Amino acid sequence: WMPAYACQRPTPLTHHNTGLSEALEILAEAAGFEGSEGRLLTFCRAASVLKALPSPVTTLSQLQGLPHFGEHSSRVVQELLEHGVCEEVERVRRSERYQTMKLFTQIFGVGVKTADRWYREGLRTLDDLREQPQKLTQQQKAGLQHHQDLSTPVLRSDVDALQQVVEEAVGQALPGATVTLTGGFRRGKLQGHDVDFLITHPKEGQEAGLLPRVMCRLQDQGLILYHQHQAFERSFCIFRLPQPGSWKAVRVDLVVAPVSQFPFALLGWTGSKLFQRELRRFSRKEKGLWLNSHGLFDPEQKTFFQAASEEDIFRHLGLEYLPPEQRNA
DNA sequence: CGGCATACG
DNA sequence: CGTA
DNA sequence: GCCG
Ligand SMILES: Cc1cn([C@H]2C[C@H](O)[C@@H](COP(=O)(O)OP(=O)(O)OP(=O)(O)O)O2)c(=O)[nH]c1=O
Ligand SMILES: [Ca+2]
Ligand SMILES: [Ca+2]
Ligand code: NA
């Protein structure tokens, strides 16, 4: 009925169990703030199972036989179904630890480990961080200065203008190179935390050295508020996006892949994050193959699969094809 | 109980 | 350590 | 936290 890996089932962007999945994802996020990747994964997988169901869960017995629902996740759903709230979830939501770890980890340049250290040092607010700026990396200073803009969602309707400026820079850097929108927007999201572009060229090898040339040109056009190099193949930058009478900062990721690897990079960067983790787990644990954003490796034959398309990759792995809009695990 | 995705900057 |  |  319900397979155990998220890559084995369609997961649409919008579904019939939103409130239940959001509660489980709070517990997932809190598990992550405490360093328990295992508990985070189970809560995320349980949430994702609900996203794949064809109708709302209305009674506890509808969880019977679903994967990733044991005593804990089932108790969470039960309380939500009976009372409209789950005490554990609310306790997490209002905890000082959760709220502060959430605030700090949302800063670009701050991960769970840094946030945790700052929390143990007694820091609680962004103004706390701004008072001692000498303790911040350059990346964190930019994340902190731009935090307000970066906390507002990027709209799908912003994306086309941004893709056009990136295409112009890419075209000058390397005529014939292409720009593909990936990430959540390619899965159909109408808003997202950042924009993801995948760049390649139809002649294998021509893309080598491309990304510094692209970044230089965008920086010369005045469009880059931050990037790490202001050789590489991924750039995590903050872009100047036009707005009425002004502009806002937005996060934009650029990645370059050779065309031979483009299907693997397209698959990886289109996500969702849980979908890719589950796909790589399935590949390795069920098929004996090692998957990443560069390729698919058979460690017995010591050979890489060639792929001309995402469809090829699903077929290699023995999985029914899922379009990007059904990869919202 | 072991395992939990897999990279690059 | 950060990032995807 | 859950699966196998
Ligand atoms: C963060 C992250 C992303 N990815 C891949 C899959 C993600 O869909 C893709 C883009 O990363 P994100 O931009 O972080 O996620 P997103 O585009 O799906 O969500 P949003 O709309 O909020 O911006 O990169 C991983 O494979 N592993 C990770 O840890
Ligand atoms: Ca994104
Ligand atoms: Ca991104
Ligand atoms: Na962060």
CSV table of C-alpha atoms (C1' of nucleotides) and ligand atoms in Angstrom, one decimal:
chain,number,residue,atom,x,y,z
A,1,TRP,CA,0.0,0.0,0.0
A,2,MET,CA,2.4,2.7,1.3
A,3,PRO,CA,6.0,1.9,0.4
A,4,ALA,CA,8.6,2.8,3.0
A,5,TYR,CA,10.9,5.0,0.9
A,6,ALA,CA,9.6,8.4,-0.2
A,7,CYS,CA,11.1,8.0,-3.7
A,8,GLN,CA,8.7,5.1,-4.3
A,9,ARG,CA,5.5,7.2,-4.1
A,10,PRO,CA,4.2,10.5,-5.5
A,11,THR,CA,4.2,13.4,-3.1
A,12,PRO,CA,2.3,16.4,-4.4
A,13,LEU,CA,3.1,19.9,-3.3
A,14,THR,CA,-0.3,20.4,-1.6
A,15,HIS,CA,-2.0,17.6,0.2
A,16,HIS,CA,-4.7,16.5,2.6
A,17,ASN,CA,-2.9,16.3,6.0
A,18,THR,CA,-1.1,19.7,6.2
A,19,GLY,CA,-1.6,20.3,9.9
A,20,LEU,CA,-0.6,16.8,10.9
A,21,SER,CA,2.6,16.9,8.8
A,22,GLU,CA,3.5,20.4,10.1
A,23,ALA,CA,3.3,19.2,13.7
A,24,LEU,CA,5.6,16.2,13.0
A,25,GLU,CA,8.0,18.5,11.2
A,26,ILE,CA,8.3,20.7,14.3
A,27,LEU,CA,9.5,17.6,16.3
A,28,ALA,CA,11.8,16.8,13.4
A,29,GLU,CA,13.3,20.2,13.5
A,30,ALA,CA,13.7,20.1,17.3
A,31,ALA,CA,15.3,16.7,17.1
A,32,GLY,CA,17.8,18.3,14.7
A,33,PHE,CA,18.6,21.1,17.0
A,34,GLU,CA,19.5,18.5,19.6
A,35,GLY,CA,21.8,16.6,17.3
A,36,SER,CA,19.5,13.5,16.8
A,37,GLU,CA,19.6,13.0,13.0
A,38,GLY,CA,17.9,9.7,13.5
A,39,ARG,CA,14.8,11.1,15.2
A,40,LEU,CA,14.7,14.0,12.8
A,41,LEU,CA,14.6,11.5,9.9
A,42,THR,CA,11.9,9.4,11.4
A,43,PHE,CA,9.7,12.4,12.1
A,44,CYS,CA,10.3,13.8,8.6
A,45,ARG,CA,9.5,10.4,7.0
A,46,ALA,CA,6.4,10.1,9.1
A,47,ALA,CA,5.3,13.6,8.0
A,48,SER,CA,6.1,12.7,4.4
A,49,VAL,CA,4.0,9.6,4.5
A,50,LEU,CA,1.0,11.8,5.4
A,51,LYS,CA,1.7,14.1,2.5
A,52,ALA,CA,1.4,11.1,0.1
A,53,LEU,CA,-2.0,9.9,1.4
A,54,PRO,CA,-5.0,10.4,-0.9
A,55,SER,CA,-7.3,11.9,1.8
A,56,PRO,CA,-7.2,13.3,5.4
A,57,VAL,CA,-6.4,11.1,8.3
A,58,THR,CA,-9.5,11.2,10.5
A,59,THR,CA,-9.1,8.2,12.8
A,60,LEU,CA,-6.1,6.7,14.5
A,61,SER,CA,-6.7,3.3,12.9
A,62,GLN,CA,-5.9,4.8,9.5
A,63,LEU,CA,-2.2,4.9,10.6
A,64,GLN,CA,-2.1,1.1,11.0
A,65,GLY,CA,0.3,-0.4,8.6
A,66,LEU,CA,1.7,2.9,7.5
A,67,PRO,CA,5.5,3.0,7.6
A,68,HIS,CA,7.3,5.2,10.1
A,69,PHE,CA,4.4,5.5,12.5
A,70,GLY,CA,5.2,3.9,15.8
A,71,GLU,CA,4.2,4.8,19.3
A,72,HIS,CA,5.6,8.4,19.3
A,73,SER,CA,4.4,9.7,15.9
A,74,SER,CA,1.0,7.9,16.4
A,75,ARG,CA,0.5,9.5,19.8
A,76,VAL,CA,1.2,12.9,18.2
A,77,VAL,CA,-1.4,12.3,15.5
A,78,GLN,CA,-3.9,10.9,18.1
A,79,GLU,CA,-3.7,14.0,20.3
A,80,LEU,CA,-4.1,16.3,17.3
A,81,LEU,CA,-7.1,14.3,16.1
A,82,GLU,CA,-8.7,14.3,19.6
A,83,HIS,CA,-7.9,17.7,20.8
A,84,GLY,CA,-6.6,19.9,17.9
A,85,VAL,CA,-3.2,20.3,19.6
A,86,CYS,CA,-0.3,18.1,20.8
A,87,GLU,CA,1.1,19.1,24.1
A,88,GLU,CA,4.6,18.0,23.2
A,89,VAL,CA,4.6,20.1,20.0
A,90,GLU,CA,3.3,23.2,21.8
A,91,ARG,CA,5.9,22.7,24.5
A,92,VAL,CA,8.6,22.7,21.8
A,93,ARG,CA,7.1,25.7,20.0
A,94,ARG,CA,7.2,27.9,23.0
A,95,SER,CA,10.6,26.6,24.4
A,96,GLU,CA,13.4,29.2,24.5
A,97,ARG,CA,15.8,26.6,23.1
A,98,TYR,CA,13.7,25.9,20.1
A,99,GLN,CA,12.9,29.5,19.3
A,100,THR,CA,16.5,30.6,19.7
A,101,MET,CA,18.0,27.7,17.7
A,102,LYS,CA,15.5,28.4,15.0
A,103,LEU,CA,16.4,32.1,14.9
A,104,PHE,CA,20.1,31.5,14.8
A,105,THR,CA,20.2,28.6,12.3
A,106,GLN,CA,18.1,30.7,9.9
A,107,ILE,CA,21.0,33.1,9.6
A,108,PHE,CA,23.0,32.4,6.5
A,109,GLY,CA,26.4,31.2,7.7
A,110,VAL,CA,25.1,29.7,11.0
A,111,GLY,CA,24.5,26.0,11.4
A,112,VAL,CA,23.2,24.0,14.3
A,113,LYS,CA,26.6,23.6,15.8
A,114,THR,CA,27.3,27.3,15.9
A,115,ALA,CA,23.8,28.2,17.0
A,116,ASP,CA,24.1,25.6,19.9
A,117,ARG,CA,27.4,27.2,21.0
A,118,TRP,CA,26.0,30.7,21.0
A,119,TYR,CA,23.0,29.4,22.9
A,120,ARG,CA,25.3,27.9,25.6
A,121,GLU,CA,27.1,31.2,25.8
A,122,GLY,CA,23.9,32.9,26.8
A,123,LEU,CA,23.1,34.6,23.5
A,124,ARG,CA,19.4,34.8,22.5
A,125,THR,CA,18.7,37.6,20.0
A,126,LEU,CA,20.1,39.0,16.8
A,127,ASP,CA,21.0,42.2,18.6
A,128,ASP,CA,23.1,40.0,20.9
A,129,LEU,CA,25.1,38.9,17.8
A,130,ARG,CA,25.4,42.4,16.4
A,131,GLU,CA,27.0,43.7,19.6
A,132,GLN,CA,30.1,41.5,19.3
A,133,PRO,CA,30.6,41.4,15.5
A,134,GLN,CA,34.3,40.6,15.7
A,135,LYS,CA,33.3,37.0,16.6
A,136,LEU,CA,31.5,36.6,13.3
A,137,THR,CA,32.7,35.1,10.0
A,138,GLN,CA,32.4,37.3,6.9
A,139,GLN,CA,29.7,34.9,5.7
A,140,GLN,CA,27.8,35.4,9.0
A,141,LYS,CA,28.1,39.2,8.9
A,142,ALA,CA,26.4,39.1,5.5
A,143,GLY,CA,23.8,36.7,6.7
A,144,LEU,CA,23.1,38.9,9.7
A,145,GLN,CA,23.0,42.2,7.9
A,146,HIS,CA,20.7,40.8,5.2
A,147,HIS,CA,18.6,38.6,7.6
A,148,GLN,CA,15.4,40.7,7.4
A,149,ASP,CA,15.3,40.5,3.5
A,150,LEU,CA,16.3,36.9,3.5
A,151,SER,CA,13.5,36.0,5.9
A,152,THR,CA,10.9,37.1,3.4
A,153,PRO,CA,10.0,34.4,0.8
A,154,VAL,CA,11.1,34.7,-2.8
A,155,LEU,CA,8.1,34.8,-5.1
A,156,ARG,CA,7.9,32.6,-8.2
A,157,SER,CA,7.0,35.8,-10.0
A,158,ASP,CA,10.4,37.3,-9.0
A,159,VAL,CA,12.3,34.3,-10.6
A,160,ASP,CA,12.0,35.1,-14.3
A,161,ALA,CA,13.6,38.5,-14.1
A,162,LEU,CA,16.4,37.0,-12.1
A,163,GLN,CA,16.9,34.1,-14.5
A,164,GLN,CA,17.2,36.6,-17.3
A,165,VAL,CA,20.0,38.5,-15.7
A,166,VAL,CA,21.8,35.3,-14.9
A,167,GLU,CA,21.3,34.1,-18.5
A,168,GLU,CA,22.9,37.3,-19.8
A,169,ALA,CA,26.0,36.9,-17.7
A,170,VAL,CA,26.2,33.2,-18.5
A,171,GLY,CA,25.9,34.0,-22.2
A,172,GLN,CA,28.8,36.4,-22.1
A,173,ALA,CA,30.9,34.1,-20.0
A,174,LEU,CA,30.3,31.1,-22.4
A,175,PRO,CA,28.0,31.4,-25.4
A,176,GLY,CA,25.7,28.4,-25.7
A,177,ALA,CA,25.7,27.7,-21.9
A,178,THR,CA,22.2,27.2,-20.5
A,179,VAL,CA,20.5,28.1,-17.2
A,180,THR,CA,17.9,25.7,-15.7
A,181,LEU,CA,15.7,26.7,-12.8
A,182,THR,CA,15.8,23.9,-10.2
A,183,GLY,CA,15.0,23.5,-6.5
A,184,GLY,CA,11.5,24.0,-5.1
A,185,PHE,CA,10.4,26.3,-7.9
A,186,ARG,CA,10.9,23.5,-10.4
A,187,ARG,CA,8.8,21.3,-8.1
A,188,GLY,CA,6.0,23.9,-8.6
A,189,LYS,CA,6.4,26.0,-5.4
A,190,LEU,CA,5.0,29.5,-5.7
A,191,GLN,CA,7.4,30.8,-3.0
A,192,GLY,CA,10.7,29.6,-1.6
A,193,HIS,CA,13.5,30.5,0.6
A,194,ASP,CA,16.0,30.9,-2.3
A,195,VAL,CA,16.5,30.5,-6.1
A,196,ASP,CA,18.5,27.6,-7.5
A,197,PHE,CA,20.1,27.6,-11.0
A,198,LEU,CA,21.9,24.8,-12.8
A,199,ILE,CA,24.3,25.8,-15.5
A,200,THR,CA,25.8,23.6,-18.2
A,201,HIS,CA,26.9,23.6,-21.8
A,202,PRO,CA,26.1,21.0,-24.6
A,203,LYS,CA,29.8,20.4,-25.4
A,204,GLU,CA,31.3,18.3,-22.6
A,205,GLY,CA,34.3,20.1,-21.1
A,206,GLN,CA,33.3,23.6,-22.1
A,207,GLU,CA,31.8,24.3,-18.7
A,208,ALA,CA,35.1,23.9,-17.0
A,209,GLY,CA,36.1,27.2,-15.3
A,210,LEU,CA,32.7,28.7,-16.0
A,211,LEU,CA,31.4,29.7,-12.6
A,212,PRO,CA,34.1,32.3,-11.7
A,213,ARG,CA,33.5,33.9,-15.1
A,214,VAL,CA,29.8,34.1,-14.4
A,215,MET,CA,30.3,35.4,-10.8
A,216,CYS,CA,32.8,38.1,-12.0
A,217,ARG,CA,30.3,39.4,-14.6
A,218,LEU,CA,27.3,39.5,-12.2
A,219,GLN,CA,29.5,41.3,-9.6
A,220,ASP,CA,30.6,43.8,-12.2
A,221,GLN,CA,27.0,44.5,-13.0
A,222,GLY,CA,26.4,45.4,-9.4
A,223,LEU,CA,24.0,42.5,-8.8
A,224,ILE,CA,26.0,40.5,-6.1
A,225,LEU,CA,25.7,41.7,-2.5
A,226,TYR,CA,27.7,38.7,-1.3
A,227,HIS,CA,29.5,35.7,-2.5
A,228,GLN,CA,32.5,33.7,-1.2
A,229,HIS,CA,34.9,34.8,-4.0
A,230,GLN,CA,34.0,38.5,-4.2
A,231,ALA,CA,38.1,27.2,-9.1
A,232,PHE,CA,34.6,26.3,-7.9
A,233,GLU,CA,31.4,24.8,-9.2
A,234,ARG,CA,28.8,25.9,-6.5
A,235,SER,CA,28.2,29.5,-5.5
A,236,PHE,CA,25.9,30.5,-2.6
A,237,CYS,CA,25.3,34.2,-3.1
A,238,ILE,CA,23.0,37.1,-2.1
A,239,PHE,CA,21.6,38.9,-5.1
A,240,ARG,CA,20.1,42.3,-5.5
A,241,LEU,CA,16.5,41.8,-6.7
A,242,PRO,CA,14.5,44.8,-8.1
A,243,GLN,CA,11.5,46.0,-6.2
A,244,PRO,CA,9.2,49.0,-6.6
A,245,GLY,CA,11.4,52.1,-6.2
A,246,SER,CA,14.1,50.0,-4.6
A,247,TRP,CA,15.3,46.4,-4.2
A,248,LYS,CA,15.7,43.5,-1.8
A,249,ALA,CA,18.4,40.9,-1.0
A,250,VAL,CA,17.6,37.4,-2.1
A,251,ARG,CA,19.6,34.1,-1.8
A,252,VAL,CA,20.6,32.6,-5.2
A,253,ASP,CA,22.5,29.4,-5.7
A,254,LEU,CA,24.4,28.7,-8.9
A,255,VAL,CA,25.8,25.3,-9.8
A,256,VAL,CA,27.7,24.2,-12.9
A,257,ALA,CA,27.8,20.7,-14.1
A,258,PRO,CA,29.2,19.0,-17.2
A,259,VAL,CA,26.4,17.9,-19.6
A,260,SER,CA,27.3,14.2,-18.9
A,261,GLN,CA,26.4,14.8,-15.3
A,262,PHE,CA,23.5,17.3,-15.9
A,263,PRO,CA,20.7,14.7,-15.3
A,264,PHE,CA,22.2,13.7,-11.9
A,265,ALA,CA,22.7,17.4,-10.9
A,266,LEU,CA,19.2,18.3,-12.1
A,267,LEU,CA,17.8,15.4,-10.0
A,268,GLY,CA,19.8,16.3,-6.9
A,269,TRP,CA,19.2,20.0,-7.0
A,270,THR,CA,15.4,19.6,-7.7
A,271,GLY,CA,14.9,17.9,-4.4
A,272,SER,CA,13.1,17.8,-2.2
A,273,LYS,CA,15.9,17.3,0.3
A,274,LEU,CA,14.1,14.4,1.9
A,275,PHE,CA,13.3,12.9,-1.5
A,276,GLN,CA,17.1,13.0,-2.4
A,277,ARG,CA,18.2,11.5,0.9
A,278,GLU,CA,15.6,8.7,0.5
A,279,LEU,CA,16.6,8.2,-3.2
A,280,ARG,CA,20.2,7.8,-2.3
A,281,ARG,CA,19.3,5.5,0.6
A,282,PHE,CA,17.2,3.4,-1.7
A,283,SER,CA,19.9,3.3,-4.3
A,284,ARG,CA,22.6,2.1,-1.9
A,285,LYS,CA,20.5,-0.2,0.4
A,286,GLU,CA,18.1,-1.8,-2.1
A,287,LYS,CA,20.0,-1.7,-5.4
A,288,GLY,CA,23.7,-1.7,-4.3
A,289,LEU,CA,24.4,1.5,-6.3
A,290,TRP,CA,26.0,4.7,-5.0
A,291,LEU,CA,24.1,7.9,-6.1
A,292,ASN,CA,25.1,11.5,-5.9
A,293,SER,CA,24.6,14.7,-7.9
A,294,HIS,CA,27.5,13.7,-10.3
A,295,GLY,CA,26.5,10.1,-11.2
A,296,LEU,CA,25.4,6.6,-10.2
A,297,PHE,CA,28.2,4.1,-9.5
A,298,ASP,CA,28.1,0.3,-9.4
A,299,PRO,CA,30.8,-0.6,-6.9
A,300,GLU,CA,30.8,-4.2,-8.0
A,301,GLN,CA,31.5,-3.6,-11.7
A,302,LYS,CA,33.3,-0.3,-10.9
A,303,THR,CA,31.3,1.5,-13.6
A,304,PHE,CA,29.2,4.7,-13.8
A,305,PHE,CA,25.7,4.7,-15.4
A,306,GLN,CA,25.3,7.1,-18.3
A,307,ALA,CA,22.1,9.1,-18.1
A,308,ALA,CA,20.7,11.4,-20.7
A,309,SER,CA,17.7,12.3,-18.6
A,310,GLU,CA,16.1,12.0,-15.2
A,311,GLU,CA,13.9,9.3,-16.7
A,312,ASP,CA,17.0,7.3,-17.3
A,313,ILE,CA,18.0,7.5,-13.6
A,314,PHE,CA,14.7,6.3,-12.3
A,315,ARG,CA,14.8,3.4,-14.8
A,316,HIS,CA,18.4,2.5,-13.7
A,317,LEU,CA,17.1,2.3,-10.1
A,318,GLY,CA,14.0,0.3,-11.0
A,319,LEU,CA,11.6,3.1,-9.8
A,320,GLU,CA,8.5,4.5,-11.5
A,321,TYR,CA,9.2,7.9,-12.9
A,322,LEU,CA,8.1,10.9,-10.7
A,323,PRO,CA,8.0,14.4,-12.3
A,324,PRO,CA,9.4,17.2,-10.1
A,325,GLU,CA,5.9,18.2,-8.9
A,326,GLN,CA,5.6,14.7,-7.3
A,327,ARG,CA,8.9,14.8,-5.5
A,328,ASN,CA,7.7,17.1,-2.6
A,329,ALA,CA,8.6,14.6,0.1
B,1,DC,C1',21.3,-3.7,17.2
B,2,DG,C1',23.2,-0.6,13.0
B,3,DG,C1',21.8,2.7,10.2
B,4,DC,C1',20.1,7.0,9.0
B,5,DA,C1',22.7,10.9,1.8
B,6,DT,C1',26.2,12.8,-0.1
B,7,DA,C1',28.5,16.1,-1.8
B,8,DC,C1',31.3,21.1,-2.4
B,9,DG,C1',33.2,26.0,-0.3
C,1,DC,C1',32.9,24.7,10.3
C,2,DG,C1',29.6,26.6,6.5
C,3,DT,C1',26.6,25.5,2.3
C,4,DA,C1',23.4,22.7,-1.3
D,1,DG,C1',12.2,7.1,16.2
D,2,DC,C1',11.7,3.7,13.5
D,3,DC,C1',12.9,-0.4,10.0
D,4,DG,C1',14.7,-4.5,8.8
E,1,LIG,C1,19.7,21.8,1.8
E,1,LIG,C2,19.9,20.6,0.9
E,1,LIG,C3,19.4,20.7,-0.4
E,1,LIG,N1,19.6,19.6,-1.2
E,1,LIG,C4,19.1,19.7,-2.6
E,1,LIG,C5,17.6,19.3,-2.7
E,1,LIG,C6,16.9,20.6,-2.5
E,1,LIG,O1,15.6,20.6,-3.1
E,1,LIG,C7,17.8,21.5,-3.4
E,1,LIG,C8,17.7,23.0,-3.1
E,1,LIG,O2,18.0,23.2,-1.7
E,1,LIG,P1,17.1,24.3,-1.0
E,1,LIG,O3,17.1,25.6,-1.8
E,1,LIG,O4,17.6,24.4,0.4
E,1,LIG,O5,15.6,23.8,-0.9
E,1,LIG,P2,14.3,24.0,-1.9
E,1,LIG,O6,14.6,24.8,-3.1
E,1,LIG,O7,13.7,22.7,-2.1
E,1,LIG,O8,13.3,24.8,-0.9
E,1,LIG,P3,12.9,26.4,-1.0
E,1,LIG,O9,11.8,26.4,-2.0
E,1,LIG,O10,12.5,26.8,0.4
E,1,LIG,O11,14.1,27.2,-1.4
E,1,LIG,O12,19.1,21.0,-3.0
E,1,LIG,C9,20.2,18.4,-0.9
E,1,LIG,O13,20.3,17.5,-1.7
E,1,LIG,N2,20.6,18.4,0.4
E,1,LIG,C10,20.5,19.4,1.3
E,1,LIG,O14,20.9,19.2,2.5
E,2,CA,CA,15.5,26.9,-3.2
E,3,CA,CA,19.2,26.7,-2.4
E,4,NA,NA,22.0,28.9,8.6
